């Protein structure tokens, strides 16, 4: 059950962490001089699915794909079918995340959680419905649909471990998805909509006030409770955002690391950590998204990304680009010599 | 000759850059959404040694190693022999840069430009003297020694190309080397010493005022001319800093990219770009050093690093950690599909 999953996420292993820190401090360098590589190695050492040491085996980027009813509000410049076209392109290896994942030695798992099109052969089918409800007039979904998809995606994630995967990355695809993301950041952080609504996929600036108004309307109509992250997801999120939260919950349940992507992912991470604070030690930032609301979301997660790429592609591309940073931390730990 | 080398650094290829930009804008994504990956690919396309396209072949991190007379002023906590011990460890593959270079598929070239010890078998010997002169009482070296070492190291660098290397990284090793680095940043940027002197290799805070005083003294005694970067290097730099400048000049002469490291490298890049402004399009930042003077140096180079690792190891480790970012830009360019 989902209550049992949340309950059973392990604490980080303090003993393992202390053993890793003592190891690091004895390496061939001034103490502390590898900076956040050192801290990342210790962070990884405490994740129980890594068996007491910083290591990377297989890598998986899980790309959650869905359509959104709020597309009808005029908040996205791209036509709705682009979600389906780009999900199919993911199965061919031609998208940004595909190419970056291949550089990293990672596999991309393309997951349809609610595309408004016929199912695409080759994509993993977890579809809740053909797009979620339009958040400007009512909820994205029912509470039950959100909890079922959390549990499904969490189980899928953990099951990859059972297959060799030690490091996850999250991403999404869905036209209009930066609207619900902004809604959820506004709810969880207490920030006004204006502070967290961006251009998404090159929305013209002339259309920004409409998008702010839509966010505020979604919130006012649905009255999401910020102390119930499931409620927030269900009311003002989307199936893609639920899916990403699910990957985070499942990785945490398996005691394994998950790399965030950009702003969409930060909104899902705010939900995951409200739902289960025990998720937080498993999350690793990648990059600092170019979306307006990035800073605020990151501040609330107490996260400082490694990469400043002015990226806003999504779909997991940042996560993939950071996987060699994680591998680097593990290589430093295992392969450096010792001062003594 | 060194005058001829400087004269013959090629301009970037604007045609190649325009061809790359048009290619990029046609890739399977919203225009501009890969952010600085896009700009980096176009930057690389204009470098004539890359043959009109962003690509990476062989990779080399050149680690310039020397001792400094100013060590006698009390500005470094590590004993002087650590330079020699750590240079020998570089030949064994046990240092930070070695392990990160191996992750990146790069080779480390350890170059002795003036270690105060017997020559170390296996290290490339370009030694000017057994340590440079103490910059608090006089010059580090003569003008002629600085120009000879520039030319030597520039030629060595370019000769690697002639062997398959397309991407360089720079680093250094030398006890007390953060003192001359701060001197040169102070000279080139106009900043007071206090603004740019840091802790280096974990100097105790109680010893900082002494290090500031030493920098100001070096400057006052030598009167380096900030409009003559060779003069600045020779007077208030060191052999390691000259060596790094030489790698930059040689990479630029060969029309090839060079990744910077941390603060030491930023001081050498300020010198290289004063000496030959034509170097600048070939320089790629890696990380944002944790040294105090990092921001000021970077601002003067108009550079924004990709990586925020709070690193201050040196020796090329940041450069190595950024090599997969360069490879990523090339993979995006070559392997992504097209919108059309
Ligand atoms: C070809 C294409 C590929 C993409 N991959 C990610 N996104 C990104 O942009 C979309 C959200 O922005 P908005 O809220 O402005 O619609 C999502 O699909 C997101 O990951 C894409 C967008 C496009 C157009
Ligand atoms: C074991 C060891 C390895 C290093 N590798 C780089 N550095 C770094 O620290 C030195 C300069 O700092 P300062 O000006 O405070 O002496 C250089 O060798 C630099 O790359 C090292 C320092 C130590 C001690
Ligand atoms: O940071 C995000 O991933 C992002 C922002 C805008 C559009 N698509 C993705
Ligand atoms: O950024 C640098 O590389 C640095 C700073 C202090 C000490 N050693 C290296």
CA dist., res. B19 & res. A109, Å (int): 33
Task: Output the CA–CA distances (angstroms, integers) from residue A235 to A44, A111, A192, A210, A217, in the order listed.
Answer: 34, 22, 18, 20, 12
Residues with Cβ within 8 Å of B3's Cβ and at least 6 positions away in sequence, in order, are none
Task: For residue B313, report the distance from its CA to the centre of ligand 4, in Å.
Answer: 5
Q: How far is CA B131 from the centre of its chain?
A: 20
Residue B191 maps to which CATH number? 3.40.50.10210
Task: Tell me which residue has its CA closest to atom 4 in ligand 3.
Answer: A312
CA dist., res. A233 & res. A225, Å (int): 10
CA dist., res. A306 & res. B289, Å (int): 13
Identify the bridge partners of residue A108 per DSSP, sorted by sequence position: A61
CA dist., res. B235 & res. B229, Å (int): 10
**B55-77 per-residue burial string, b: 16 or more CB within 10 A, e: under 16:** bbeebbbbbbbbbbbbbebebbb
* One-character DSSP codes across A139-154: -SS-HHHHHHHHHHHH
CA dist., res. A155 & res. B110, Å (int): 49
A335 contacts on B by Cβ (under 8 Å): 93-94, 99, 102
CA dist., res. A273 & res. A277, Å (int): 5
Q: Alpha-carbon Rg of chain B, whole angstroms?
A: 19
CB B71 within 8 A of CB B81: no
CB B210 within 8 A of CB B75: yes
Q: Same domain for A46 and A100?
A: no
A304 contacts on B by Cβ (under 8 Å): 308
Q: Which of A37, A76, A203 should we substitute to test contact with B (largest number of B Cβ atoms within 10 Å)?
A: A37
The length of chain B in residues reads 340
Q: C-alpha angle B27/B32/B34, rounded to 5°? A: 75
Percent helix / strand / coil, chain B, rounded to 5: 50, 10, 35
User: Ligand 2, from B87, B89, B175, B268: best to mutate by most atoms within 8 Å of Cβ?
Assistant: B175
Sheet with B58-66: list strands edge to edge: B124-125, B107-114, B58-66, B165-173, B258-259, B283-284
Does residue B314 come out as left (phi exceeding 0), alpha (psi in the -120 to 50 range) or beta?
left
The length of chain A in residues reads 340
Residue A38 maps to which CATH number? 1.10.1610.10
CA dist., res. A56 & res. B261, Å (int): 26
B35 closest CB neighbour out of A28, A30, A310: A310
User: Which bound ligand lies closest to the C-alpha atom of B265?
Assistant: 4
Q: Same domain for B29 and B67?
A: no
Q: How far is CA B135 from the centre of its chain?
A: 21
CA dist., res. A191 & res. A181, Å (int): 13
Q: Same domain for B203 and B299?
A: yes
CA dist., res. B88 & res. B118, Å (int): 11
Sheet with A283-284: list strands edge to edge: A124-125, A107-114, A58-66, A165-173, A258-259, A283-284
Residue among A136, A139, A325, A127 nearest A214 (CA): A136
CA dist., res. B131 & res. B68, Å (int): 5
Q: Counting beta carbons within 10 angstroms of the beta carbon of residue A137, is it exposed (0 to 12), middle (13 to 18) or buried (19 or more)?
A: middle
Give helix B229-236 / helix B208-222 axis angle, nearest 10°: 130
The parent domain of residue A7 ranges over: 2-55+328-340
The CB-side HSE value for B126 (13 A sphere, CA atoms) comes to: 29
Backbone angles phi, psi at B30, to 5 degrees: -65, 130
Helix (H) or strand (E) holding A284: strand A283-284
Ligand 2 and B175: CB distance under 6 A: yes
CA dist., res. A183 & res. B218, Å (int): 57
Q: Same domain for B75 and B21?
A: no
As annotated, the binding site of A includes: 86, 172-178, 201, 263, 289, 312-313
Task: Tell me which residue has its CA closest to atom 1 in ligand 4.
Answer: B262
Strands in B223-296 per DSSP E: 258-259, 283-284
What three-state secondary structure class fits B118? Answer: coil
Number of structural domains in chain A: 2
A102 contacts on B by Cβ (under 8 Å): 331, 335
Q: Same domain for A30 and A133?
A: no
H helix intervals, A237-275: 239-253, 263-275
Residue among B298, B36, B187 nearest A288 (CA): B36
CA dist., res. B169 & res. B108, Å (int): 9
CA dist., res. A116 & res. A130, Å (int): 4
Ligand 2 and B95: CB distance under 6 A: no
Asked whether the beta carbons of residue B335 and residue A89 sit closer than 8 angstroms, the reply is no
Q: Same domain for B103 and B6?
A: no
CB B2 within 8 A of CB B152: no
Size of interface A-B (CB pairs under 8 A): 143
CB A187 within 8 A of CB A219: yes
Ligand 4 and B196: CB distance under 6 A: no
CA dist., res. B306 & res. B46, Å (int): 20
B263 contacts on A by Cβ (under 8 Å): none
Method: X-ray
As annotated, the binding site of B for substrate includes: 86
Q: Same domain for A187 and A83?
A: yes
Pocket of ligand 1, beta carbon within 6 A: A 76, 78, 82, 86, 172-179, 200-201, 203, 313-315; B 29-30
Most distant CA atoms of chain B, gap in Å: 66
Q: Alpha-carbon Rg of chain A, whole angstroms?
A: 19
Torsion angle of C-alpha atoms B336, B337, B339, B340, degrees rounded to 10? 140
Q: Same domain for A265 and A286?
A: yes
Ligand 2 and B178: CB distance under 6 A: yes
Identify the bridge partners of residue A107 per DSSP, sorted by sequence position: A60
Q: How far is CA B330 from the centre of its chain?
A: 22
**B258-283 per-residue burial string, b: 16 or more CB within 10 A, e: under 16:** bbbbbbbbbbbbbbbbbbbebbbbbb
User: Would you give the end-to-end CA distance of chain B in angstroms?
Assistant: 50
As annotated, the binding site of B includes: 86, 172-178, 201, 263, 289, 312-313
* CB-based contacts of B51-55 (< 8 A; 24+ apart in sequence): B52/B13, B52/B16, B52/B19, B53/B16, B53/B20, B53/B333, B53/B334, B54/B20, B54/B329, B54/B330, B54/B333, B54/B334, B55/B166, B55/B330, B55/B334
* One-character DSSP codes across A68-98: BGGGGGT--SS-TTHHHHHHHHHTTT-SHHH
Q: Same domain for B19 and B159?
A: no
Asked whether the beta carbons of residue A95 and residue B28 sit closer than 8 angstroms, the reply is yes
B36 contacts on A by Cβ (under 8 Å): 308-311
Q: Same domain for B38 and B104?
A: no
Residue among B72, B71, B68, B160 nearest B115 (CA): B68
């Amino acid at each position: 059950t989902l209550h049992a999953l949340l309950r059973d996420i392990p604490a980080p292993d303090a003993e393992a962490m202390a053993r890793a820190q003592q190891h690091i401090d004895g390496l061939l360098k001034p103490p502390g001089s590898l900076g956040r590589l050192e801290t990342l190695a210790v962070q990884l050492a405490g994740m129980p699915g890594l068996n007491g040491t910083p290591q990377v085996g297989e890598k998986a980027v899980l790309v959650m794909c869905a359509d959104h009813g709020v597309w009808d509000e005029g908040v996205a410049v791209s036509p709705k079918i682009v979600t389906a076209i780009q999900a199919a392109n993911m199965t061919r290896g031609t998208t940004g995340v595909c190419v970056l994942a291949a550089q990293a030695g990672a596999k991309v798992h393309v997951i349809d959680v609610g595309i408004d099109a016929e199912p695409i052969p080759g994509v993993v089918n977890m579809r809740v419905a053909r797009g979620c409800g339009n958040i400007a007039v009512g909820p994205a979904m029912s509470r039950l649909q959100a909890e079922a998809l959390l549990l499904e995606v969490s189980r899928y994630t953990c099951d990859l471990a059972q297959r060799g995967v030690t490091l996850f990355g999250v991403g999404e695809l869905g036209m209009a998805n930066t609207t619900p993301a902004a809604a959820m950041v506004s709810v969880f952080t207490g920030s006004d909509a204006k502070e967290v609504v961006g251009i998404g996929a090159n929305l013209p600036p002339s259309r920004i006030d409409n998008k702010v108004d839509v966010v505020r309307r979604a919130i006012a109509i649905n009255q999401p409770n910020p102390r119930d992250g499931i409620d927030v997801l269900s009311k003002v999120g989307g199936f893609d955002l639920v899916g990403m939260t699910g990957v985070m919950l499942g990785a945490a349940r398996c005691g394994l690391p998950v790399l965030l992507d950009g702003f969409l992912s930060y909104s899902a991470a705010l939900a995951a950590c409200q739902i289960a604070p025990a998720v937080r030690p498993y999350l690793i930032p990648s990059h600092f998204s170019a979306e307006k609301g990035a800073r605020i979301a990151l501040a609330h997660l107490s996260m400082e990304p490694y990469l400043h790429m002015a990226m806003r592609l999504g779909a997991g591309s940042g996560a993939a680009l950071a996987m060699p940073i994680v591998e680097a931390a593990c290589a430093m730990f295992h392969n450096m010599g010792e001062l003594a």
